[PDB]
Symmetry: D2
């Protein structure tokens, strides 16, 4: 039977993910024989995460708290919101009310809920170029048109942002939202400077726009001085945040959040129960305890954080020993490094050869771009690989490198 006839026309806005084509082409070789170390993942290190400790909490809460197995309010258990509030004020410089927090199915869920309430099909949403592949996909399947703005070692080029806004309006285009990942961007790995952050806020006010700040990697900072979220600088209330504990507490727990105000918060809350009903009860209680027991500092700060900072150094050391000639980013936050093949080279076919020949998995990155740029780009992860995997990983990458240029 042809089910294609029953699809909604908006289903044609839904398309495949390149980061999924290779993550499957590898899943085929990883189970059907071959052994491979990947630099393509986006997960945090499960070994750096206190699993046994989380198992203990999971075990206690399930037998201790009956609610751990039942529905939770649409915006999350009050205690998690009260704790997340204090947590943000403590470690991310955020003075936010618990009533303004909405616990979602991870940042992904937060970005989706927001798009549903803020996007009308055709609306143009401007983003960094490149940007997080999944947010672009999320927004386009909602009918949005994406317009990207170039980035550099200091993040989005705020000067190019204003020009894009003007070029768009000069065409009579309707623009409303700006989507940005200020700290440790996926996939570039760069972070917006404080100078560009204040300039961004000025531009949002100037053109009367709203900003959606993605803080997924705010707690993965290693070098930064005292860089604060745009939200902490938001005196006009033009920014909305989409956060997550996935890179901390674990990426499978599905715990994230939205910080918004006024009628936007209201509509977000209103539409939620019929969409996901509520964020997972165990996850919320596990997170509530993790925070209350002060395990953030005890395990993530003075623990997993250093573990990531290290893998970052070794991957860069490895790159700066074997590929000192090539161009790549120097992240002071996040969990990715964007490597660049010679200008012109194909990044998707090269990513294939690394598997088809050297047995190492890397993400093309090309699909992370909002236009024709980024062909020769390649994203590399260092948060999942072991200390040993990384050197061999990029060494094999360096093997095929000169083996072609």
């Amino acid at each position: 039977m042809d089910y294609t006839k029953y699809l909604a026309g908006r289903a044609n806005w839904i398309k495949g993910s390149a980061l999924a084509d290779v993550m499957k082409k590898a899943s085929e070789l990883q189970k059907k024989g071959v052994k491979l170390i990947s630099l393509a993942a986006g997960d945090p290190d499960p070994e750096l995460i206190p699993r046994a400790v989380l198992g203990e909490i999971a075990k206690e809460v399930l037998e201790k708290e009956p609610k751990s197995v039942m529905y939770t309010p649409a915006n999350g258990i009050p205690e998690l919101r009260e704790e997340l509030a204090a947590f943000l004020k403590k470690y991310d410089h955020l003075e936010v009310s618990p009533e303004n927090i909405v616990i979602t199915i991870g940042g992904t869920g937060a970005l989706d809920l927001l798009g549903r309430v803020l996007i009308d099909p055709g609306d143009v949403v401007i983003t960094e170029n490149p940007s997080y592949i999944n947010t672009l996909l999320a927004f386009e399947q909602l009918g949005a048109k994406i317009e990207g703005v170039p980035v550099d070692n200091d993040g989005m080029r705020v000067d190019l942002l204003e020009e894009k806004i003007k070029e768009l309006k000069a065409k009579g285009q309707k623009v409303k939202l700006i989507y940005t990942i200020p700290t440790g961007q996926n996939p570039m790995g760069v972070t917006m400077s404080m100078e560009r952050r204040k300039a961004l806020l000025e531009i949002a006010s100037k053109y009367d726009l709203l900003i959606i700040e993605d803080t997924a990697y705010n707690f993965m900072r290693y070098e930064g001085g005292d860089i604060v979220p745009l939200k902490a600088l938001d005196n006009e209330g033009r920014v909305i945040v989409a956060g997550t504990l996935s890179k901390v507490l674990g990426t499978g727990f599905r715990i994230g959040w939205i910080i918004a105000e006024g009628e936007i918060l209201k509509k977000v809350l209103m539409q939620k129960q019929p969409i996901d009903f509520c964020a997972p009860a165990i996850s919320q209680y596990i997170a509530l305890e993790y925070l209350k027991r002060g395990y953030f500092e005890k395990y993530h700060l003075e623990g997993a954080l250093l573990g990531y900072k290290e893998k970052r150094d070794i991957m860069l050391k490895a790159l700066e020993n074997h590929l000192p000639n090539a161009e790549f980013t120097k992240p002071i936050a996040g969990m990715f490094v964007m490597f660049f093949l010679p200008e012109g080279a194909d990044g998707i076919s090269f990513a294939n050869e690394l598997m088809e020949r050297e047995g190492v998995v890397v993400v093309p990155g090309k699909p992370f771009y909002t236009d024709e740029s980024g062909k020769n780009a390649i994203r590399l992860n260092f948060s999942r690989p072991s200390k040993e995997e990384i050197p061999i990983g990029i060494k094999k990458l360096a093997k095929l490198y000169k083996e072609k240029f």
Copy 2:
């Protein structure tokens, strides 16, 4: 600042509930701490659930499985889908391939993913009248127009279903989907007969329609014979199921699924990673073990199920005892009883008056209807309250009843 201006016009399709307005007046009475018995809730008894056991497996999973903290595939871990296929084939008379099942954020998430792929704004979707408010709400905020078909003690009046289709088509109206809750429907509590289930499939085939079957309460059947889901008789492949373990495993785990095929499955999977990324890793693993070691039959079939059946009889005897001259449903499945005030009576204010004067919380019901009927309806839940609360619950309900009627 007026955020109203930044909203997307489709955000106007988002509206309040009733199972929210009453739950806010109850929390307002509980905030300023006042005792109250609840018959409104839709949760399974957390005490009839083997929390302790789940906790141990939660501890096991997190301790020994690193993947229980990371991203699972968008459609779920292969082992869970393979187990579900077996669990369904054994307890729900359904034969399905693991490749055709997708683990979602409960039945809710399943219904939403399905709405997003099958609904274009303006599409009419046919449902039972009354039906589950959250699905009505979920589909309407996607822009669908709801057309209801009356139900009786044998479920949806299938004959009137064809009548509605004929009426709609006579007007030139486009319809493609029928959403039905065959067993232990929420809020009516009635279950479609096998006779009507066979006719429904024929009507869907005659008008080339697709059916969305909500199996949420298929495992909460008491004094029932041998009923099988529409999907088991679906020889043309016209039905899609939206199931869940919410009532079995726990309503907070967020574990549900979609069973679709062909291009509909493809599109559903393709859009999932950018929406929820994946169902909770823990939950997925907690459910995997739970099923693999036969705890469904050990704790639910011969433990929880019997507890619910018992609470069912107590509420009915209580109703039959105190309000013999009033009308209400006699469920053979599910967790609710629909009570009817005198024809003409306002159930919404009655519920408020019952909570303000007697301290018992019940759900209006009118909001579950698709047209102007059901004004005198009141939904009653018996799966969460205690055996002691029930009698006292409907007792007080009867006092205000005879007080006015």
Copy 3:
């Protein structure tokens, strides 16, 4: 074949118009023998229009101007726009650039073009209650939600308008446009007072809303003072007008216009060629010469106008002496009088009986309301019927009335 399955879901937003249903029930009576006296349709008197003259200029234009048979720019021939600009300056307080004028397929097309550029599905658009049925229908098939505001002898109640707006925003509803017919409204026949017009402009500014002014009957005024359009008072550029020459030159020529600015004008014009290509060349050239030769004064102002004014006096005169106990409107402009049956009486039912038992055609009216009110309303037209037919008509109308009430 069942074409229902091919329809776009938005086609479901398209619905029937009683003002064209019973109007088609009369089209059957005429072409079937029955001698009918019509007080329905809103056509101008074809005998008060210089048909012969127009016939002469039509001949001329066709033989002397080769363009009268070919396409024209999407926004209309420059000469007509320039001629309309001056015309509007001399008779309607308007100082507009010919560049800001777009020649459309009557005001109908003007309203549809604006809806397409300003309305996202779900958007709330505020209108008067009652309001012009075709415009409500036009906006809703574009997915808008209509919210009406009661009118009186002085037009829209501006005080209730601000309450509705505060009401909407309190619910978190998004609103943006206000559609008003300030002079000689269809169907009430009332005109907004200069006092309320200034207040409306204040509210639009206060809430940052746009106003679309329908000027259809600005040239069928009979006794106001220097009442000026909202657009001539629009110092903030918040109003857009949708005008037409159909009530002057002839309702069948399809000559109307949109007056807008900036990006709205840009987009309105960008989308036009692909939907209508251009307004009728022959009609544009006929209108041009009609204007250039001073026929507006010679025939409309000093001919048609007076005839219509006479027809109005006659209808009100007849309504006053044979039906003095009924309440109805007294228009100072336009071509309609809204007549009212006793509260509770059914106007739709009354309309069918009148036609069936007396051969007089009137328009129900209820269809023009935005809510449940207006059941007893009946709209009467005095522009088309001869001055001999008018008294005979309402005389019969009075008879059915009195024997019923």
Copy 4:
């Protein structure tokens, strides 16, 4: 003020048109002194049209028929529908009922009315490549996704059509309509062979698709045998036609039609009054007399048609004589000829340089393609320019051609 913020998101789907942009850049040249030879716009020759004749009928109609200045039923006066039905049966092998004919504002309005009832945002609509730009623009601003299918001198490559269809379905894409211009296509000027017309009908039936047949040039055929419209072969009723008399009676009268059945016809009719109200009364009556008096035979068949055929031969003679090494279409019908510059050559700049240096106007070509093809295309029209102007225009064109290549 920034009106961009008030735009509907869907306003962003509206974009510029080279065809409209070039026509306006030429009208400015005509007024700005310069006198040029035009081979662009798709207008009929105003001298080959019996203007003088149409003039007296226009005068006659206006003075004798009062209905010629008033509204008409949304679908057009009954007499016209009946005459068109007879006209189609005689000169276009079409047996259609007068009830299935809807008089629209030209072929453009017909196509817009159909898109609104048949397209949901995101729907894929397949067309020829290239195709008429206004239809592509019309469907895309309605949110449609266009997929073109290559054509040759025998029209659409039906074999490539089925491969495209299989390509779309394999990706899970939803498609339902196919828009085609079988005879004398704009811009290619080629006509589908009867062999492909039957194959197209088979494919539509095989995949259950609807076909919208554009018959704009069915009456400007010169050498085809007895080619019949797909609609005359539509035994399953899968084709809907969008026709017009613009190329016969005159392109500026705005007299076109839709031929559909069942629910599609019902909905196209229900929505029509609120978008255009009705086609121009004068144009309808003028067309009614034109047909009834047999002027199609007397002035078009034995007049205009032979005149156009001559211009058709003259342009081909001039081209083959001065550009014998360039490839260009040889139309057997229509009014356009697609000229091709050498592969790689930019057609839009060439058109500007031609208009600037030689003062001859042509259309860029590239805008009519659904993909990146056509860069070197240039559309040439032979219906409007005089017998004399054509050779001069093509010579000047040849001059710049070899001056560049």
